[PDB]
Design a protein around this ligand. Structure first.
Ligand SMILES: [Ca+2]
Ligand SMILES: [Mg+2]
Ligand SMILES: [Mg+2]
Length: 429
DNA sequence: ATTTTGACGCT
DNA sequence: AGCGTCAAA
């Protein structure tokens, strides 16, 4: 009752760019705008692998991971943009730079946590308090929320936009605007701010995005996906029981893999809401102390993970796969590709040092051997003392050379299906 | 023969 | 330290 926390103490948003790499390419090439199109890496093998897909193309069934040749069977007029290739490998610089554009705009509004190349969490609690003081009891107009959905509404006693407006009207007609401590009002002001933030992103970059607004990161992330693209969704604390009552467990962030499968298998449930019937101790007994407490609160819509103040990635990495017959089988091959990776890494590190006043101090080398299901077969670290590609490639070879079983120095066995260099452990400079 | 990333947890 | 999990385009 009066002491039961309800996880309504924060306003958190998650902003996620729509079909991000596709929008980057469509901004650059107006011929691709408003078309079924996809972004592909490599072209020789089955037309290249698709990594991003416009919503027009998704209507034909085109998805990520599809070979372009196969996507063309579903969508013969599909347009394609290719990821840049440099030093023999795909190079994602254009998308990293577009990401910086968006992150820098979002940072003007509030502290953000960079969650991926195209998404960030936003802690809006303080901004909401400020805006509520500015508003001075003034009601919030639907015109301030032109792309907002209120999850769960409309309810009670045939076009999409019509439903959106009906739900928003019910919500705003039911708000108590004089209570500055009302969580629902705080979320609503949050959504007003997010409309402003999304408008700024689109104005200043050309890119559209979706967003979720709720009381914590997990619900904000879930909310964001409910009405893509180019829309935002408010998930209130009160919407949680109905929302979770038919929500597959795997849809909640962190439960899409083995742990989620085990929750389903061990407990014999399917939906997030069903978790409420277990005690905290029961959940801890199956999934561990940390996961158990997290599940117990999360299934009630409560999560405390903070929006971390971090706009920049903590690692800078470069990797290449060598699938099937292309696996690296000679020492020379391994050294040449380590050099290519190290040269890209050097370029990115030097730019990072100039832009962000920091230097990486550890180099992580990872390889995969043909026949291993795991992404990485072996990982070794060494000191990163100079931004020099020849030194980094030599040091990586030094730390992995003993993995070569082959009695012949010139041959590498078992062949390598992957090389990965990652700069970590940044210090101020 | 998706590939190329990035964060964080465990021991 | 080195390995595993989960998530992005
Ligand atoms: Ca996205
Ligand atoms: Mg994303
Ligand atoms: Mg996606």
């Amino acid at each position: 009752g009066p002491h039961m926390a309800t996880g309504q103490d924060r306003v958190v948003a998650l902003v996620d760019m729509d079909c991000f790499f596709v929008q980057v390419e469509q901004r650059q090439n107006p011929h691709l705008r408003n078309k079924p199109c996809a972004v592909v890496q490599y072209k020789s093998w089955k037309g290249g692998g698709i990594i991003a897909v416009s919503y027009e193309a998704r209507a034909f069934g085109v998805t990520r991971s599809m070979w372009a040749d196969d996507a063309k069977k579903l969508c013969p007029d599909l347009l394609l943009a290719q990821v840049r290739e440099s030093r023999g490998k795909a190079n994602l610089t254009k998308y990293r730079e577009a990401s910086v554009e968006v992150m820098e705009i979002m940072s003007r509004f509030a502290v953000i946590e960079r969650a991926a190349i195209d998404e960030a969490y936003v802690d809006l609690t303080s901004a909401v308090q400020e805006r509520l003081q500015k508003l001075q009891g003034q009601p919030i107009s639907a015109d301030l929320l032109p792309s907002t959905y209120i999850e769960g509404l409309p309810q009670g006693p045939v076009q999409k936009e019509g439903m959106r407006k009906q739900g928003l009207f019910q919500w705003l007609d039911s708000l108590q605007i004089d209570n500055l401590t009302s969580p629902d009002l705080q979320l609503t002001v949050g959504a007003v701010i997010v409309e402003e933030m999304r408008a700024a992103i689109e104005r200043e970059t050309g890119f559209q995005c979706s967003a979720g607004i709720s009381h914590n990161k997990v619900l904000a992330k879930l909310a964001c996906g409910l009405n893509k693209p180019n829309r935002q969704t408010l998930v209130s604390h009160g919407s949680v029981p109905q929302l979770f009552s038919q929500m597959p467990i795997r849809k909640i962030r962190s439960l899409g893999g083995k742990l989620g499968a085990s929750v389903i298998e061990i407990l014999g449930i399917e939906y997030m809401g069903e978790l409420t019937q277990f005690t905290e101790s029961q959940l801890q007994s199956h999934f561990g102390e940390k996961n158990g407490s997290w599940l117990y609160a999360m299934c009630r819509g409560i999560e405390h993970d903070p929006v971390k103040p971090r706009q920049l990635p903590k690692t800078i990495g470069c990797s290449k796969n060598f699938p099937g017959k292309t696996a690296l089988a000679t020492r020379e091959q391994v050294q040449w590709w380590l050099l290519q990776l190290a040269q890209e890494l050097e370029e990115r590190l030097t730019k990072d040092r100039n832009d962000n006043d920091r230097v990486a101090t550890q180099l992580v080398v990872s390889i995969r051997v043909q026949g291993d299901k795991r992404l990485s077969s072996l990982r070794r670290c060494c000191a990163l003392t100079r931004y020099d590609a020849h030194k980094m490639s030599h040091d990586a070879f030094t730390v992995i050379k003993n993995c070569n079983t082959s009695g012949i120095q010139t041959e590498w066995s078992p062949p390598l299906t992957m090389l990965f260099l990652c700069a970590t452990k940044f210090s101020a400079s």
